[PDB]
Each structure stands twice: as structure tokens, then as C-alpha cells.
């Protein structure tokens, strides 16, 4: 079975990053490991195009993955990333097409929510960012402290609202003291329908 995953939105957005289209097949079998990956972009076959399958030996079977690296521009201009897996134990070339959305994007609403007073009775508090009314579900939220990365956050999966939009919450747990000292916190949201695929909203005491 051949699954085909997109590049991470951050990684197609940022020229400093590198976008990859990952073709994950789980099976293939022994006696027939000879899965010829075929990578097409729009129409054209890319040979390698720096395609890189690295073999794994799992379960009772093999887990084989090839990673096609994408031009930021192409995916943003939505080309079709067609993965094809061959073999002989396999009567037909397993074909898989991805590209982005194609649209109609909805811009996320980023409001930052302070801890509750009842929670200042705890000596760790929680910082909340509500990101709502986006489309597609393809988003990326992160947190910062003062100006620098906070690793201490948990983001909920996008869940579909009554609207026909998606929403999420992201919860930064900081120290009660760290909040009370009027220290600046911030949630930094990345989605297609944002100003430069990027926005940021600040929580300060």
C-alpha cells in the first residue's frame, strides 16, 4: 500500500527550508523487494530529482520510503506530484497524486488567551491560542518567549467547526512567576491565507 504525503507547509513557505514529498509504502514483500519508484511532476518524470528511498526492515515485512524534494515555487504553483510503485508481485503500478488545495482558502483568526484567575492559584499557568476559521486544515502554529522559541507547547489537531472551517487551540504551559513578571509571550501562526504565509499574536501581562 502506497501513501503519499505533502511537504510541511513551513518548509514550502520558507526558502531557508526544503520541501519534500514522501512516498511511504508499507509491504512490498520478500522475493519481490524490487519496487521501482517512479516520480512524476506535472507530466514529466524526474528520474531521481534527488529521490531518496531508504530501506527499513519491520513487522514481518518491509517499510520502504522515497522522498522527492520539491521546488517551493512549483508546489505553491501546485504541480502534481505523482508517485508510482512497480514490482512483479504487483500486477499494476500503484499510482498516487498530490498537489495543494486548489482554490478556497480561508484566513485564520488568531486570538491569544490569558490564564484564568482560578489558575493563578496554581504555580504553573497556561497560555492559550485560539486559531479559528481557516481552510484548509493545513496550518502551523508555534510559540515564542520574549522573542525566542518556546519548546513547551502542545497543539490540538484541526477540528472542523460548524462553519465548515477548521479550528485549533495551542497551549503554552509557563511558570506562574514567568507570567507574573510581565514577560512577553507570542503565538506565531503559519497558513496559506496569511499575510506572507505568516502571522504572530502576543500575550503579555
Amino acid at each position: 500500500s502506497v501513501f503519499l504525503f505533502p511537504p510541511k507547509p513551513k518548509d514550502t513557505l520558507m526558502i531557508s527550508r526544503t520541501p519534500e514529498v514522501t512516498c511511504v509504502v508499507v509491504d512490498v514483500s520478500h522475493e519481490d523487494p524490487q519496487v521501482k519508484f517512479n516520480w512524476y511532476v506535472d507530466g514529466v518524470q524526474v528520474h531521481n530529482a534527488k529521490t531518496k528511498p531508504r530501506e527499513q526492515q519491520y513487522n514481518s515485512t518491509y517499510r520502504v520510503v522515497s522522498v522527492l524534494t520539491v521546488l517551493h515555487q512549483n508546489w505553491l504553483d501546485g504541480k502534481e506530484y505523482k508517485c508510482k510503485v512497480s514490482n512483479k508481485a504487483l500486477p499494476a503500478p500503484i499510482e498516487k497524486t498530490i498537489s495543494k488545495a486548489k482554490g478556497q482558502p480561508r484566513e485564520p483568526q488568531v486570538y491569544t488567551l490569558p490564564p484564568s484567575r482560578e489558575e493563578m492559584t496554581k504555580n504553573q499557568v497556561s497560555l492559550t491560542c485560539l486559531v479559528k476559521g481557516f481552510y484548509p486544515s493545513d496550518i502551523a502554529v508555534e510559540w515564542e518567549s520574549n522573542g525566542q522559541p518556546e519548546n513547551n507547547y502542545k497543539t490540538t489537531p484541526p477540528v472542523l467547526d460548524s462553519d465548515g472551517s477548521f479550528f485549533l487551540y495551542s497551549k503554552l504551559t509557563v511558570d506562574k512567576s514567568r507570567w507574573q513578571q510581565g514577560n512577553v509571550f507570542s503565538c506565531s501562526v503559519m497558513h496559506e491565507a496569511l499575510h506572507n504565509h505568516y502571522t504572530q499574536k502576543s500575550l503579555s501581562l
Binding site: 526544503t18 534527488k50 524534494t69 521546488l71 517551493h72 515555487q73
Partner: protein, 99 residues
């Protein structure tokens, strides 16, 4: 966005054994700009070569020219070895006299 280099070796004037000339390796189409480049004689590095200023093209990929004075013979092999991230093992390209 990474891009593997294109490598092309050639000479200034029409070649003739035993006659002084200049060897040229033109490395282009690459990204990032961090690259290693050497001129080889029989698989071993030639000392003291020259290079032009590093530039780039309308599509952003980089290009540059390594060169030196040489006299072609019938037995001596000349090449251009290049190391870059996109390359797991370096690439060696041999000089073709009809170019």
C-alpha cells in the same frame, strides 16, 4: 531549494599536443554557493590555479570559471573534481577534446 551542479571542461584555443594553451572548467546551475573545485592531472590535484568572480543567473543558480595554463599530450588525462551537499560522493568529469 537545492540544485546539483552542471560541469563542463574545454580549452581556449583549438587544441594541439605539445602546444601551450589554457584549460577551462565551467561549473554552473548550482545552489548553495559553498562548493569545492579542483583541476586534476592523471587523477592528482594541480597546484596554483585561477578562478573568476562567483556570479549567478536570471534563475538564481550560481556559476564560476576555474582555469590554468597547460600543454595537452596524448597520454595525460585532465579532469575537474567537484564536492557539494547534493553529492554523496564527489563527481569527477574528464576533458573531451572535441568540445
Amino acid at each position: 531549494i537545492q540544485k546539483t551542479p552542471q560541469i563542463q571542461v574545454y580549452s581556449r584555443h583549438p587544441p594541439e599536443n605539445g602546444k601551450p594553451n589554457f584549460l577551462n572548467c565551467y561549473v554552473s546551475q548550482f545552489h548553495p554557493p559553498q562548493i569545492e573545485i579542483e583541476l586534476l592531472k592523471n587523477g592528482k590535484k594541480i597546484p596554483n590555479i585561477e578562478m573568476s568572480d562567483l556570479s549567478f543567473s536570471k534563475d538564481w543558480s550560481f556559476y564560476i570559471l576555474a582555469h590554468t595554463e597547460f600543454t595537452p599530450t596524448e597520454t595525460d588525462v585532465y579532469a575537474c573534481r567537484v564536492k557539494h551537499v547534493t553529492l554523496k560522493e564527489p563527481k569527477t568529469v574528464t576533458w573531451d577534446r572535441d568540445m
